[PDB]
Structure 1
Amino acid sequence: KEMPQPKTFGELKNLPLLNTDKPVQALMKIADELGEIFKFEAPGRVTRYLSSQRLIKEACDESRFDKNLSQALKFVRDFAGDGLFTSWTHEKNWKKAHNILLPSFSQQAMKGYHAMMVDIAVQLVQKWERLNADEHIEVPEDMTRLTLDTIGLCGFNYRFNSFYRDQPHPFITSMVRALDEAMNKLQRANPDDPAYDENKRQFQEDIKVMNDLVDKIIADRKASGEQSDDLLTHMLNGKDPETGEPLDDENIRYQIITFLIAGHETTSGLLSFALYFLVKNPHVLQKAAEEAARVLVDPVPSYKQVKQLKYVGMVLNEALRLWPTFPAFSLYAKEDTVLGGEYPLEKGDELMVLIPQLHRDKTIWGDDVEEFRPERFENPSAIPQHAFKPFGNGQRACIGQQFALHEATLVLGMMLKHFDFEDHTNYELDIKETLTLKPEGFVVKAKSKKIPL
């Protein structure tokens, strides 16, 4: 159709547009200007950004499109390896690990993780109970402490003890710096230029630090013989029904690194955005707090009680609507095909699904798309197909969805039961972009309702 394309910079084509610390937000504005589809070129490379439910519903057809590793994911793959998130669907270790780990991530398995989630959630509540009169909370910082700890504990019985520290754990320093370097590689003609030798040296170091530390966690567990009901145990013992094979220790390492990435990056952002919207929308906070008080009648919340926090669940979905914390996923055409009746694609052609824009499609949600209204999610059946994709699509959808939502619902429920919140700075949303999105500098004050634990 003579596809729309944003401004170009001679031989660099569109690449300079991503030379910014907020590339996703830049892409969202481009989508606002250009519409449901735009081409994005750089030297030697092209992708097409999709923003409408009309086109994205075709992109979600697994017979036509499969998951692609974006350039960022190809760089994350240098340390996340062939774990689930950075593997191609056709790689043997993808379907093997997928089949082995699904049972570990089901709604049923959440019952088993619940106690350990409560352990970390209570540490959060206690921290906040123990703050003095005039003190405030650094929201994304504390949400990250929580979610990292939760996956460490539930994942491999390891306590990061984030609420005991200011300094991040050695693994995290390397992980964050690796993630940063992976995103920075996306703006470099001549990667072999000696000006990046220190960047490369640091990256290799960081890779080796994560490996050495995770490999030791594996080794120690094999050595102890302990059978704690966690992801590491299920990976050590599990066999893929198809091949009959277990995961090898290298792949297990990559899965653990992957889970730590997820638990540090994604769920913490969700909790941070949810709290942000609640303090910006007092009527919604009140309704959520009402439910929390009504449902969480015991000092320790139970698994069943978390399932009964329906409005808290809707609040989280609405937070995921506006700011899906992993904001884009990539696809490639399995064969030649035509998108939307108008855009012919060849086998191998790539697409990027711009999730925050999909979630702002006024044809789907109505004109009030920027408003925070959890009630939009009262009935999944009234939401059109492929309109809401915060956890991606199909067989390559987020394996951690049930875990993330259970943790987030539990913690947000507890938070709303135990405290009233003040937006004491009238915080202005400022979204930092790493692998994920987070509200940087978001702070609040929390006044205890003095309900015992």
Structure 2
Amino acid sequence: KEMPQPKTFGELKNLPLLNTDKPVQALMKIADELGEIFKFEAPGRVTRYLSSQRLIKEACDESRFDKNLSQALKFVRDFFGDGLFTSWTHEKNWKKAHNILLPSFSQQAMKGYHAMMVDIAVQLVQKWERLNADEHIEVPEDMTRLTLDTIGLCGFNYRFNSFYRDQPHPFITSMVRALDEAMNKLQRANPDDPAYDENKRQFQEDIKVMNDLVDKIIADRKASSDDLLTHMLNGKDPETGEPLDDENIRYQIITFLIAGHETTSGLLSFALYFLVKNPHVLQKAAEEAARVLVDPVPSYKQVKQLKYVGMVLNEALRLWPTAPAFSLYAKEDTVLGGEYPLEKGDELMVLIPQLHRDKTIWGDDVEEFRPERFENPSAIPQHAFKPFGNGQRACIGQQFALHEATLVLGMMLKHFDFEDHTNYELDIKETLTLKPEGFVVKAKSKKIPL
């Protein structure tokens, strides 16, 4: 078969389709129109967007495809370097860092982050307890305060003190600007037009703000633990026998500060969004929180007891996976789905929100928010639900994000009643990652001591 392709713009081919503030949502609409696979061409570049579990299960075969750096990721390497997220699988620094840092996400490590997660979660509950009547909550803004602080504290013993700030923290402002610019770059026909001279200048200055903070974390540690930073500076890879060098460690820190919070903020924001729009689901989740979380602060074992809350989060990730795409390349010539020949090196994009809407897997009601879908996660076929990516290049922090989200959402649901007082219309902001923009609620305290 010859694969479908969306509308073209003469010599720019499909490039102008990306000239939009919401390019993943645009791609999703193209998928609904064209089906499980389409070609996307730009001047000098081609990739193939996959949306069906039928093809994606083959894309996920690590003997045939490896992680690719999409254009997006190539632009973000400018500050992420050969950190775990933007390193090729075959770069020496990938497996070394993987091996050195995986022990920071062991069960014992997770247990040892619990207390610090609680520290930040108590700060969020308190801010909300302390609002006056009729004040409201800027949801994704507060979720970012919580998630950035949580990775700062758990990972690096560093306090961003975001709940002591009325604006976003400076690190968040430059992060968002840098991600925005990477996203806007995707559509640029002539990236070296001098019209983009200012864009590049703002980009470097934002890279600088982020690296200045990295330098401080490193200085604090040299001046003061058993956390992610301890492993970065001290662990040896059992294979090579070598530790990470200084340059790579700096890339790891920036990588973990961003990947370690942005997408978790998004998940909590989408999860609160879907709860307030599904009052019976909210009540069922609130019932579990009350039942389970009997003590003044949650225990580790208690968070693991929050099954329905877990289900809520996975259902939020099904509809709006907050890192919505990952990319693969063909390790050798190969045929996808018995119908689409690929040559070695050809690129694929997995369009995760469309995968998550495959009616052959999920049934006809794919737009409904139904956490019950996840009542037995075993039931889900392989490669049908991939919000944390694939194989050895899957999310290292999956358990950390989920533990944090589950803890926080559990506390919110124990401690407050929520009101969607504006009848908020979902508006999804893209910064490569996804998050609701302008989402606000009011929270009425249930006056349960903390």
Moved more, 360-369 or 174-183: 174-183
What's the offset of the Cα at 1:313?
0.4
> Deviation per CA, 1:175-218, whole angstroms, max 9, x where unpaired?
22221211121122222221111111222222233223312321
Say if 1:107 and 1:402, in contact at 8 Å, map to a contact too.
Answer: no
- Distance between the aligned counterparts of 1:209 and 1:446, measured in 2? 34
State the distance in 2 between where 1:173 and 1:286 align. 35
The offset of 1:136, in angstroms, is 1.1
Structure-1 residue corresponding to 2:308: 311
Once the two structures are TM-superposed, the CA of residue 229 in structure 1 deviates from its matched residue by 2.0
CA distance in 2, matches of 1:130, 1:213: 30
1:413 aligns with 2:410: yes
Q: CA deviation at 1:378?
A: 1.1
Distance 1:362 1:262 in 2: 30
Post-superposition shift, 1:73? 0.6
Show CA shifts across 1:353-397 (max 9, x none). Answer: 000000000000000111111111111221111100000000000
For 1:141, the equivalent position in structure 2 comes to 141
Between 185-194 and 135-144, the greater mean CA deviation after superposition: 185-194
Q: Distance in 1 between matches of 2:48 and 2:268?
A: 31
- Matched residues in 1 for 2:5 and 2:106: separation? 42
Structure 1 residues 424 and 212: alpha-carbon distance in aligned structure 2, compared to 1, 3 A threshold: closer
Residue-by-residue CA offset, 1:267-326 (whole Å, 9 max, x unaligned):
000001001111111111111111100110000100000000011001100000000000
Shift of 1:401: 0.3
Over the aligned positions, Cα root-mean-square deviation in angstroms equals 1.0
Find runs of 4+ consecutive structure 1 residues off by over 6 angstroms. none
Deviations 1:315-357 (A, max 9, x none): 1000000000000000000000000000000000000000000
Post-superposition offset of 1:250: 1.5
Spell out, residue by residue over 1:86-137, the C-alpha distance to the aligned partner (whole angstroms, 9 max, x if none): 1100011100000011110123311000000000000000011011111111
Conservation of the 8 A alpha-carbon contact between 2:64 and 2:331: yes
Would you say the 8 A contact 1:72–1:182 is kept in 2? yes
Residue in structure 2 matched with residue 127 of structure 1 by the alignment: 127
**Structure 1: gaps (5+ residues):** none
Deviations along 1:120-155, one digit per CA (max 9) or x if unpaired, are 000000011011111111111110110011001111
Q: How far did residue 168 of structure 1 move?
A: 2.9
Give the distance between the partners of 2:312 and 2:107, measured in 1 at CA: 19
Decide whether the 8 Å contact of 2:141 with 2:168 is kept in 1.
Answer: no
Mapping 1:350-361, distance limit 5 Å = 350-361=347-358
Asked if the contact 1:6–1:30 (Cα under 8 Å) also holds between the matched residues in 2, the reply is yes
Aligned counterparts of 2:416 and 2:217: Cα–Cα separation in 1? 37
Residues 238-266 of structure 1 deviation map (CA, whole Å, 9 limit, x = unaligned): 11010111111211111110111123420
Alignment partners' CA distance in 2, 1:204 and 1:419 = 42
- Secondary structure of 2:421 counterpart: coil
Question: Contact between 2:76 and 2:182, CA under 8 Å: does it hold in 1?
Answer: yes
Does the aligned pair in 2 maintain the 1:147–1:264 contact within 8 Å? Answer: yes
2:262 equivalent in structure 1: 265
Residues in 2 aligned to 1:317 and 1:342: alpha-carbon distance in whole angstroms: 33
Greater mean deviation of Cα atoms: 306-315 or 375-384: 375-384
SS in 2 for 1:368: coil
CA drift at 1:452? 0.1
**For the Cα contact (< 8 Å) 2:19–2:184, is it kept in 1?**
no
Q: Which moved more, 1:388-397 or 1:280-289?
A: 280-289
Contact 1:323 1:356 in 2 (8 A): yes
Tell me, yes or no, if the aligned pair for 1:265 and 1:435 is still in contact at 8 Å: no
Structure 2 residue runs without a partner (length 5+): none
8 Å contact kept, 1:218–1:249: no
CA distance in 1, matches of 2:223, 2:419: 49
Give the aligned length. 450
- Checking the alignment, whether the CA contact within 8 Å between 1:106 and 1:402 is kept in structure 2 is no
Counterpart Cα distance in 1 of 2:397 and 2:97: 13
> Contact 1:148–1:160 (CA<8 Å) still a contact in 2?
yes
In 1, distance between residues paired with 2:99 and 2:198? 40
Checking the alignment, whether the CA contact within 8 Å between 2:101 and 2:232 is kept in structure 1 is yes
Identity of aligned residues (%): 100
- In structure 2, distance between residues paired with 1:312 and 1:64: 36
Query: Match for residue 167 of structure 1?
Result: 167
1:110 counterpart residue number:
110
Q: Is the 8 A contact 1:318 1:372 kept in 2?
A: yes
Structure 1 residues 229-238 or 146-155, which shifts more? 229-238
Moved more, 45-54 or 201-210: 201-210
Query: d(CA) in 2 for partners of 1:14 and 1:422?
Result: 42
SS at match of 1:207: helix
1:204 counterpart residue number: 204
> How big is the shift at 1:223?
3.8
- TM-score, length of structure 1 as denominator length: 0.98
User: Corresponding residue for 1:8?
Assistant: 8
* TM-score, with structure 2 as normaliser: 0.98
CA distance in 2, matches of 1:16, 1:435: 17
- In structure 1, the residue matched to 2:101 is 101
Instruction: Determine the structure 2 residue equivalent to 1:388.
Output: 385
Matched, 1:321 2:339: no
User: Aligned-pair distance for 1:413?
Assistant: 0.3
Match of 1:332, SS? strand
Find the aligned partners of 1:192 and 1:220 in 2 and give their Cα distance.
39
The 3-state SS of whatever aligns with 2:261 is helix
For the residues of structure 1 that align with 2:83 and 2:89, how far apart are their CA atoms? 11
State how far apart, in whole Å, the 2-side matches of 1:275 and 1:375 are: 17
Displacement of 1:174 in angstroms is: 2.2
